[PDB]
């Protein structure tokens, strides 16, 4: 779509001269993997593509109809001949202003367990190196290029904070995401629950992300693991649990 983990991407994203309303910058091929060899490289101004440099071209670009009152963000993805692409927050800078100390962003946790997690984030420059913390201890110094990285020793059902930073470079601030961890020997209570008043007077419709051996969810209560909203009469601010097999989870958060 915007970008797979498999495609090498370019390094050593250089913007080498600013103009009134063009930039001119310099970047180096992709090291080899042996799959998903690096056919061309696609340019792109805030998301949206400006020219396109074949393999065998110098690793230069004059990009046009870039404003430099503005700030921006500058990113170059790899191109396989299956069109399959690099992601940008593996080469990518941002230019403008006084953009020099700006630091990672979008910080994410995916693929949580009850024992680790996986953090992304967004550079500003993607040549820096970046520092994760959790719950403000570094865990792991990460090379340049590198957007994600897996995080352990976590205990279960347990809150952590993680942030990223990167450490200056030497010539040849950063946000943060909170997150739960799974529970160890019981089911998990479901996420984003909201709640807003139904189609008729004195109703009201709670709804909460399904948690993808579940059984269904209590609030009366809801019989099947897909679902994902409840519909009560009052006549006839709580919490959510899930069911499963033999026991119920713990309650999420109150909304």
């Known amino acids: 779509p915007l970008g797979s983990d498999n495609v090498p991407a370019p390094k ?17 091929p992709p090291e080899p993997v042996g799959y998903n060899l690096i056919d061309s490289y696609h340019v792109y101004v805030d998301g949206v593509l400006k020219v396109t440099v074949k393999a065998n071209e110098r690793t230069r670009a004059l990009i046009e109809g870039v404003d ?5 963000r500058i990113s170059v993805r790899s191109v396989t001949q299956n069109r399959q692409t690099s992601r940008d927050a593996a080469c990518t800078m941002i230019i ?10 979008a910080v994410r946790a995916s693929h949580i367990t009850c024992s680790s997690a996986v953090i992304s984030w967004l550079p500003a420059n993607s040549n820096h190196q ?16 590198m957007y994600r990285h ?25 946000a943060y995401a909170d997150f739960r961890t799974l529970t160890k020997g019981l089911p998990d209570p479901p996420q984003e629950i909201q709640l807003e008043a139904g ?3 004195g109703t009201i419709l709670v709804t909460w992300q399904p948690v993808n051996p579940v059984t269904g969810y209590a609030v009366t209560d809801i019989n099947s693991p897909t679902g ?7 006549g006839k601010a709580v919490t959510i649990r899930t069911k499963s097999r033999d ?9």
């Open 150 to 174: 897996t995080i352990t020793g976590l205990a279960p059902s347990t809150q952590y904070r993680v942030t990223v930073r990167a450490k200056h470079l030497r010539a040849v601030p950063g």
């Open 12 to 28: 050593h994203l250089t913007l080498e001269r600013q103009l009134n309303k063009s930039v001119l910058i310099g970047w180096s």
């Open 130 to 145: 970046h520092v994760v913390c959790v719950n403000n201890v570094e865990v792991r110094t990460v090379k340049p290029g």
């Open 228 to 234: 994902d909203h409840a519909l009560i009469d009052i």
């Open 247 to 255: 026991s119920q989870s713990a309650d999420s958060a109150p909304i």
């Open 68 to 72: 430099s009152t503005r700030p921006h």
């Open 199 to 201: 189609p008729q007077d």
């Open 96 to 105: 403008g202003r006084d953009t020099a100390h700006l630091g990672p962003s």
